[PDB]
From a paper:
The crystal structure of the enzyme in complex with its product represents the first structure of a carbohydrate-bound bacteriophage-derived polysaccharide lyase. The product complex structure at 1.46-Å resolution showed a K1 lyase trimer bound to five trisaccharides of [2,3-(S)-pyruvate]-β-D-∆4,5-GlcpA-(1 → 4)-O-acetyl-α-L-Fucp-(1 → 3)-β-D-Glcp, each corresponding to one repeating unit of the K1 CPS. Unexpectedly, the bound trisaccharides revealed two distinct carbohydrate-binding sites in the receptor-binding domain: the first in the solvent-accessible groove of each subunit, the second in an inter-subunit pocket beneath the “rider”. The bound trisaccharides did not induce significant conformational change of the protein (a rms deviation of ~ 0.22 Å from the free form structure between all Cα atoms), reflecting a rigid nature of the β-helix. In the first binding site, the trisaccharide spans rungs 3–7 of the β-helix with main interactions to the protruding loops at T1 and T3. Altogether, the trisaccharide binding to the enzyme is mediated by 13 direct H-bonds: three between the glucuronic acid and amino acid residues Gln130 and Lys291; three between the fucose and Lys291, Glu314 and Asn339; and seven between the glucose and Tyr186, Glu285, Trp310, Tyr311, Asn339, Trp340 and His373. In the second binding site, the unstructured loops of the “rider” domain, the adjacent T1 and B2 of rungs 7–10 and, from a neighboring β-helix, B3 and T3 of rungs 8–11, constitute the carbohydrate-binding pocket. The trisaccharide is stabilized by seven direct H-bonds: three between the glucuronic acid and Arg472/Arg378* (from another subunit); two between the fucose and Asp434; and two between the glucose and Lys177*/Asn217*. The pyruvyl group of the glucuronic acid is docked into a positively charged pocket formed by Arg472/Thr474/Arg475 with five H-bonds, and its methyl group makes a further CH/π interaction with the imidazole ring of His455. In the present study, examination of residues surrounding the bound products suggests that the catalytic site is adjacent to the reducing end of the trisaccharide in the solvent-accessible groove.
Author numbering:
A (entry chain A), C (entry chain C): 10 to 651
B (entry chain B): 18 to 651
The structure:
Amino acid sequence: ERVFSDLASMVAYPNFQVQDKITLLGSAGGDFTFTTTASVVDNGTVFAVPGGYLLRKFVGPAYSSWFSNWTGIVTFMSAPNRHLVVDTVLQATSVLNIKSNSTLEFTDTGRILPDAAVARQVLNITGSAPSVFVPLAADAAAGSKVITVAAGALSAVKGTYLYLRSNKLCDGGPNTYGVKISQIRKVVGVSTSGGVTSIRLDKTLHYNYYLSDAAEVGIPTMVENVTLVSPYINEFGYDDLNRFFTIGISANFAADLHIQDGVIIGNKRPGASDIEGRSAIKFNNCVDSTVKGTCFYNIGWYGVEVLGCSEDTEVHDIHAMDVRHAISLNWQSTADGDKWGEPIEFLGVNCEAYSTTQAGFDTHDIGKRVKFVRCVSYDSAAAGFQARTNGVEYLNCRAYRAAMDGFASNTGVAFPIYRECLAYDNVRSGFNCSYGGGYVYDCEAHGSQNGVRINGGRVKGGRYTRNSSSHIFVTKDVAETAQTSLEIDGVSMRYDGTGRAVYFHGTVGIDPTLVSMSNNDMTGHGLFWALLSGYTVQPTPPRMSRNLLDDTGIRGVATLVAGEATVNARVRGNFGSVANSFKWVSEVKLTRLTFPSSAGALTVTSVAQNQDVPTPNPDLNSFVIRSSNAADVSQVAWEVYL
Amino acid sequence: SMVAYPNFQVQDKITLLGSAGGDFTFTTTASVVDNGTVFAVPGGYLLRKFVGPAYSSWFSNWTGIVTFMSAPNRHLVVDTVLQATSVLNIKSNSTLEFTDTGRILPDAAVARQVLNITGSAPSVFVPLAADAAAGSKVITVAAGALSAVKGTYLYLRSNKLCDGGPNTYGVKISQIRKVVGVSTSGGVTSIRLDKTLHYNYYLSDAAEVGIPTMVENVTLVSPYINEFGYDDLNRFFTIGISANFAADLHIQDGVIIGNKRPGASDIEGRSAIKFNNCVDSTVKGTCFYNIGWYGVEVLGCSEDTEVHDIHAMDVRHAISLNWQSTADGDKWGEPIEFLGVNCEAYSTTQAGFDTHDIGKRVKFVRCVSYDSAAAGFQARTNGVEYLNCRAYRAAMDGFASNTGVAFPIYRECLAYDNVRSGFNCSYGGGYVYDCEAHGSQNGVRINGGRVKGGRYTRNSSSHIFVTKDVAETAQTSLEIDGVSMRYDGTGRAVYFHGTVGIDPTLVSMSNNDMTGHGLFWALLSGYTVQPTPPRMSRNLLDDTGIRGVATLVAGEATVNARVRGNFGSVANSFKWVSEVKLTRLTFPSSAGALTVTSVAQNQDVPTPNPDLNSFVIRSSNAADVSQVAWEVYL
Amino acid sequence: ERVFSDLASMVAYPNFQVQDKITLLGSAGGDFTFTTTASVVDNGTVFAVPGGYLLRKFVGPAYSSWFSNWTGIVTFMSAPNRHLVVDTVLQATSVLNIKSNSTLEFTDTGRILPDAAVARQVLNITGSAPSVFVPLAADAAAGSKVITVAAGALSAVKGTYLYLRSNKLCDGGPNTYGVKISQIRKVVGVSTSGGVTSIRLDKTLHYNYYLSDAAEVGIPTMVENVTLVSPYINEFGYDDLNRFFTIGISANFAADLHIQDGVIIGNKRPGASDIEGRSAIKFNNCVDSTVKGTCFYNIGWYGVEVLGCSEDTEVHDIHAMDVRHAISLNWQSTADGDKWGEPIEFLGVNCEAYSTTQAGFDTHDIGKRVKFVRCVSYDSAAAGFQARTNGVEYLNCRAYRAAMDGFASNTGVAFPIYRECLAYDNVRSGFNCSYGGGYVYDCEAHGSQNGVRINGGRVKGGRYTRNSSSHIFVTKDVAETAQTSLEIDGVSMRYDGTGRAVYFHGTVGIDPTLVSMSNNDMTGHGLFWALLSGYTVQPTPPRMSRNLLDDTGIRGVATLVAGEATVNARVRGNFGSVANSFKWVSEVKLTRLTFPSSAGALTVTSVAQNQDVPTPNPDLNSFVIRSSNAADVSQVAWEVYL
Ligand SMILES: CC(=O)O[C@H]1[C@H](O)[C@H](O[C@@H]2[C@@H](O)[C@H](O)O[C@H](CO)[C@H]2O)O[C@@H](C)[C@H]1O[C@@H]1OC(C(=O)O)=C[C@@H]2O[C@@](C)(C(=O)O)O[C@@H]12
Ligand SMILES: CC(=O)O[C@H]1[C@H](O)[C@H](O[C@@H]2[C@@H](O)[C@H](O)O[C@H](CO)[C@H]2O)O[C@@H](C)[C@H]1O[C@@H]1OC(C(=O)O)=C[C@@H]2O[C@@](C)(C(=O)O)O[C@@H]12
Ligand SMILES: CC(=O)O[C@H]1[C@H](O)[C@H](O[C@@H]2[C@@H](O)[C@H](O)O[C@H](CO)[C@H]2O)O[C@@H](C)[C@H]1O[C@@H]1OC(C(=O)O)=C[C@@H]2O[C@@](C)(C(=O)O)O[C@@H]12
């Protein structure tokens, strides 16, 4: 029975015995066990005393309120298998390292305040790359379940990881730095026969790992199974105390790092210039790791930065406000030497970005199997969404009021895919995939200079309004870029008092005949469905099939007399030779409804367009139906398309 | 009695026994008695020693639980069955977590609210110093006009009307924002906001701003309100969880039951969960049974609200975004940015999933309504978007808009066995993209817009019904393209409603599969003069006798084929004929221009045989002997 | 105050009295109360002592570190209303049963290691079927909110459950075993009038329950409200210790069973043959139950198996590696007698499967309202996704490198629905719905022998490349299967140096006229857009409307002279009679642009195609526009389609 009113009196007591019941009162109070066994002092769970150590008695988590200082918290978390609840406002004076099979959980009032004296990292989860590699014993193609090495070359242990690499270049995108391939894999099976060890992997290989590329494998040091529950890093008012940090949570060679909720604030001043490298959360070479629900304010660089061979990474439900990019998959500069790894299998879902200084959601020029689902960007100073790697897919994403494009690719980038994406009031365009093609499926763009900028690919379905120049702008980033075929099919791009339907950019070498336009609603554009600029000679039009140009005077029945009838209808065309124009006329579909013996072959001729001044009346436009038989008295149904 | 012991000292270790037992510290410093963590004793107080959460089993009474939670910064685990006798208020930075057996049973003496999370509107407003357009990051006020503290909130409003929908009450705009930066220069304070403004806030609309006192960062883990059998004990409540001026309120799982008797009449206002002027707040996984009004009610300027994974059974609406009656004076705020995802509703007395006539950026994703007494889904604000939602067995429409409501958007939504229609957007247009409706009177009722893709079957009247709610509603252009609307022994493909003034020439029909309807692809009623048909391009009407090769002899060939047409003058009919595409396959010197004539249709007496229908290919050159490919479309 | 240093000392003490304050120091330590009331000994929370029992005093969860042995853990969880945190490595020697209103939660080091001596089940959550049934008093149609029974036949308590069944057969799929219908429902209201009890249900009925099918109802015993937080069953290295199990988590007649995260490993050796029945998680007759986040390695049977009348089941975010199927909805063999129940309302979302020995994601031939959303299968030894019940829906799913088909139905199975699904490098096909039709909407298949195999239905939109035989293969599983109409519309199926656009399989009786092809991009295929085999007489072609076959020489303007003009253009056709070929020609759309008095009806003739060897030159192809008027001098716009 030993009770102490304060810590100093408890730890000075010389007579502790192993059988004593020991109690401390006050803010870090609790019950303790005396031992002579060497114990790791942290002044929270273990205290030094004369003749031994006091160990706090507890089950379940430890609490930050038990600790005398930050240094002790660091000591405690330097071991694996820790569960610490941050129930106090901690003042960091160093990085907090978290080790495997550990949980750091915050109560609603728990905080880590970074050091105002020195900008540094706050939480680190730090493995490392192998120091030594061994060659594969044989080529391992993409899809391989097993890799092979010489028997005894590598100590592969089931449940631990391998890091594979070769000189093959990352292939997700343009890869201008020439980053080389790597992947992290878990060992799940081992067998040895004929001097070769076959190592079965959790997941299959996503490139060919060939001996001609010096394919090799080593054992990384991973930090696995770390859970960060509601991390609260910094606090509002930080800027008045000059209290910043560099990277909030930095992970390297982590597996199953899961970050839930929390708020990370203030590694730059509010609204201030970007600061290179100062991301809130950084996943470098991390596998099966996620961020879900976290909020970000006033961040110098990226909210969530994903790089190296980070694989099966997901970001859900984040809110990022005043950051450079909310999410950015990154490249690695090879200016000072080789680098390995591109992200593989990335999901961003239900994320929100406001007032990003650069793209809301971003990739650089490497990365594979990147998907954004139901994300939204508001008021970006650049694009809402930027793809710089090939074939990035966007499902039901939305971009509002980007200063440039709602959604864009960039120089050298191939065929982003936009499905049911919606773009509102972005200044330049809704979708800009004029760099290297795009697939724009059932998308909408409203309130831009042009709805879609595109050099090739497909615009299928969707709906476009309030675009001042045109709904679709067939153009390029630069004239040197190749135009490819463009299908525009099933698109609603009606006249609403704003721009034209389609703008063909002769200035950069657009050939309109590489465009095909079928079954589009172009109602109301009249003679001004197309805009053309920069043509030296009148170009040939796109192929056009069964588009709608008018909604009145577009179907009826005429009765031939002596093989002819004149029909008033909104038939349309241009027969001039002006360089920035097309020569074209309506497709008038004719079907015979009575069957006299004088039935002949039918044609449209004598297209006349009323040119009353001041303003033309298109209901007095007309065409003639003429029969090859001069006695024809057939009733003929007529239908007017573009 | 521990609370009677006269000679307590600060030095003591103290122990209570029993169901609320534990270790205690004596103190003289002032403390709020709750008879669970703080007890009054002679000359001072006993404070329970603990780390981590408090437990309801520590408390002598409900009133003590209420006192405990009346402060912020509380974590309480409900590990017992609590009997309420008053409202439980929850304050900022607090968590209320329920164990497997913990419950709050409502007050049986007074039907009242169970949980309240209530911030307050500003007590004073100041005018904006300058116009702030939609998209503004910063607002301005006169220097000294108010004190904007970083991390706290502002409430903006003006006389501009909410613009998400028809807004028949004339609710005015408001939004809640967080202050993230402040600077003052030249007599003007510039306040940087977390999120940008979603309306123009103009001096001419008396745009103004004030400081609300928000309740922020509240987590309700598995709330269990009431229990089965409540009705035998006549034990009800009014609103289960009512929140107003809350930020980051997150409700996870739990079960809320019984503010009406099972299957009983609805009761105005008795929603299970109500979010009024809440920002960044969510309901995920909660189950609802026997609710007099809405499962989750969302109103005021609630912004970035989400409801995921709920199950609601025997409620008025599972989710309803609400208006505010202005009968007694001005009101402000419409919901902005709402997501309902993976929610399920059964046996709703009104629409399964609902909005009233305001609200912006409202999305339902993979929600399902079963056996609604009204619609599965009802949109009363403009441009509500539905992604992969499903409606089964609604008594009226699977999905519907309503009077004056513009263009809901349905993407890959599926409607099964709804009595009246799958989709009813006949009030003000709709966009029906790759949807399906099966088992109704009409698959889609629509006055204008687009039906693109999708598949329709088992609709007794027609797959598509071109009609209006009332004759005074404007018909607009309608595109029907790429739709599978085949004959399956039930209704026709498209019904044109002459009674309400439908002009079929405003409809365009391209590349649809109308196989099997024969002469009965269209239904018409209410016409007194034969209307002109829609434009029609390359639709499929028959699957047999629809392609071949003919050889002209002396400029002509008679071809047996399923060519079709109507050439009569009956008011409720169209004059039309097949589009027969002709292509020449051999190239004699006598090649001339080709045409279709002499369309003849078999009239065999029990049942006509359309394989004996025919047409003639005739050339302008009477010697033409060309081989000619023919293809029959509608 | 009674204080003890060790447990043996404490439980041997002969003189305990109810008023004693009792403390155990050290291991499994804490505070205790003595009682004479019969208590269930578990050597963790309850200990036998002379004259009665010691009960541990605590609030919040129990901990496995309190218990002397596994047997005690089992005893503790044998009662309902338990919260146990597994904070130690437990060695199982028996099945752990979990009862209602209970939570079993694992810390990062907590584990249950199965018994190496005997393969058995690890966790069981086991209710039971009714012991007695009563007939319904009246027919209850699908959609019924209420069922009726004779007053007094059964006592239906609000908040408890009912189990309904009849002799009607399950109707979700082919149901070759003749499994009969059942459902589980919760009672929410009861009233009795005129000798009839009306029972109001939580959810409506999904079949017609008829007296003529012997419709009946009984009270099952359910295990309700069980939460398993991060279950860790077995560990890597298990195979070196021959340490396996049968079923990891087996549930029957459970409601609101929610399993979160965790890892289940090793009921077979890594890469070994499948073992029938050894699923990781099994939900039989479970309602409102979910698996979210769990990882699976080296499983003999299914990752998550769903069977019986399991209703409103969801599987989210799982990773399954080296299993038979990641998810499988199952039938029930009726070889030894009747069985009841098919799954109803199933969602699989954001799940990943690697190296499955059979289909990645599977159903058997029953089940209703089954949906997979954003799931991905890699490197399956069979299909990526297999549907054996009717109308399974797939949204944005992906299949890579399946040994057979990315996505497939099977014998007798109707119309799976694929929306925006993507298939890469699957050996045989991307989509194989040739057994009973399919709906293939905006899908993509790349790197297969054929992109889509299909006998009827719709291929609408989407994009197909790098398919060695053809992009679309119109075929059947067996000749006896009915061909139905097939619509191919809006599909990008261009020539890229690989296969043809569409292959018509005459061998199995395909009539190409049942196929219609509109507005497809077939650019580059030339005369080789179709493959045909097995025809003995030349078949008639599909209907074709406004497809794209060439990208150059496809639009221009000709000027007639004396009623004719020769036009150089990439017009195409075949006029031969070879059995495995079509007779066809380009659709050339002609529109008049000038209107001379000599305007006549216009036609295409004299199609001429260059046949240079080795390489034909399509820039030398031509056709003639001829007018019915011999003096016609019209300018005529021409456009070349297929
Ligand atoms: C590992 C590393 O070098 O990280 C990069 C980081 O990704 C970032 O790279 C930028 C990239 O975002 C940009 O788009 O392209 C540039 C190349 O053209 C590239 O430089 O920023 C640089 C500075 C690196 O960031 C540093 O990384 C780490 C770390 O621990 O991983 C610490 C450094 O701290 C600061 C803030 C710093 O010391 O300046 O930058 C961090
Ligand atoms: C919602 C549903 O149960 O639909 C039933 C539909 O009502 C109909 O029921 C039949 C009824 O016509 C017949 O007379 O009695 C039968 C036996 O009791 C009864 O089954 O048809 C069946 C096939 C159901 O319709 C299918 O149901 C569902 C579903 O989720 O329940 C989806 C199917 O999609 C289609 C359109 C299809 O593709 O065939 O049919 C739906
Ligand atoms: C309840 C039951 O009988 O379960 C089946 C299980 O679903 C599985 O059935 C297979 C099915 O997967 C396959 O596709 O079709 C087969 C019929 O053709 C069918 O047999 O496997 C069988 C063996 C049953 O599994 C057993 O179920 C249970 C249980 O508790 O539910 C325990 C048994 O343990 C083993 C591993 C065993 O004893 O072998 O199998 C389990």
